[model samples]
Target: SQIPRLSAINDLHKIWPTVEEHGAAIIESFLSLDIVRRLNEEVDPFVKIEPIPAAKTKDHPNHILSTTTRLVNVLAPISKAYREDVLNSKVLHRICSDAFHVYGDYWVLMGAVMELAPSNPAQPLHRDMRFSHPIVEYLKPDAPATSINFLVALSPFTAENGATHVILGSHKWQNLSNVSMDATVRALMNPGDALLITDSTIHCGGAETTGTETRRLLTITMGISQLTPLESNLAVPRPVIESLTPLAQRLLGWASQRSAAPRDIGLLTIRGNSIEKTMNLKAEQPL
Candidate 1:
């Protein structure tokens, strides 16, 4: 299991290679409790503003409970707390580069928060980025990962509270339908825990019961820079871009070639750890 590098602690380099190797990794306490608390405060009301349905399905008697949203569009302009306090940080930038290979050249496929209600049913198994290519295409050994999604727990994720079910090594298999329930493993996590899932891996949301409280997760999807983002750059306002760190601005696609070049390049970029993980003169702004 060490080869997978499950927990990076404070050193991200240790987990970088493993994420690419195993197609998934879990970063425990990726954010401080203070930051977690703030994220809940800032996005909780926004995600739940609309009424949620309470319907029941065969597998999930409590199917009436679960919910999801594009928190990026909702919070990008609405909450400075989410940007300055959370996304605008050195660690996130490192993880984005190491996990998704987005470095300076990435785009968000989708950024959502999914909340599973008590007694909810497990979601049907699926891969997040199959839209880009056929299943057989991704099974090849040389295939590069096209996208990665971060599942950050806004609430505890227990088997009782609908933790995620991941099918280990499924990313490399040509026939996903043959995968049995025996192959899936539950990711029981606590608040602040995060699970990084490569787009090719087969996974599903966990079912929940009344024994546990509702579980909330922030879903952030990053993809190869060449792919068009699922969410548009227009959703984020100009002021929000100015308020973020240079790395955050670039990651959110402010430097996207289709748009006009930034007026002040120096204010929007600094070649740092992601390029080579060194703090030499190359870390300075480019010419």
Candidate 2:
């Protein structure tokens, strides 16, 4: 599991471990006021548009406001927190580092500005790794490909404000159609708290903002380098890549990409045989 750690924030010790156990974890007060304010301003332009409501699909209504590329360059303060508090921290970094290396190399798939408008209903339960689930199941070695998602709340996440609902342990379940909501828990986060969820978890944006407010969040997706990036690398300008840290640069897929030359491959390890064949286990087994 490519989980995260804490920066030795003593109080969060109790929380970090559970994140490792369950597929979801909430890092309390992960952002400061300054960063929160900046992110709010950054995404404001998109949220102000009139709600077309389900302009795309009923399930995907373009609640995804914007995807700010080269976030490190655009927002240096959040980048500092990203490295020190989430990525480079003593407790969290190892899992993150392992997650990065686990998938033969890793990078950010997409980073976004997200908002759920008032009267909008909860998003249908689904995994963030939507289209890639089949590829992951068929990977030679049969290990889970890391697709970790980070949702940084600019506003508080409460049930009334459309807090997210996650079905605990559903990450281990493939046939989610039969899964019930009884095991689900709402991710009620405060402003500045970040919710980290593995792509395997069955989660949805809660519907019905009974409150007269919009639920705004900054979302980022990270995945194995082997997979195609949701955001094209060509769309990113050179200056954007140059402005990032070495790790951040590589994570944006500008570096560490697979090339035609054998020498250019990031990790040259051989794939192991899948145990699924030996066990003769059918796919879609209940977790």
Give the whole-model CA lDDT for all candidates, comma-separated. 0.62, 0.57
Score residue 241 of candidate 1 by CA lDDT: 65
Give the clashing pairs for model 2: 5-92, 121-207, 122-206, 122-207
- Residue 251, candidate 2: Cα error in Å is 1.5
lDDT of 2 by residue, 194-217 (tens): 787877778887765675777777
**Model 1, which residues run further than 4 Å from truth?**
1-5, 51-73, 99-104, 131-141, 257-287
- Worst ten-residue run, lDDT, model 1? 275-284
In angstroms, give how far residue 59 of model 2 lies from its true place. Answer: 18
Q: After superposition, how far is residue 22 of candidate 2 from its true place, in Å?
A: 1.1
Q: Where is model 2 more than 4 Å wrong at Cα? A: 1-8, 11-17, 49-95, 132-134, 137-142, 175-178, 257-264, 267-287
Judge candidate 1 at residue 19 and give its lDDT. 68
Instruction: Please give, for residues 4-75, the per-residue lDDT of candidate 1 as tens digits.
Output: 435545657765566666767778777677877877777777766644433233332323234531233445
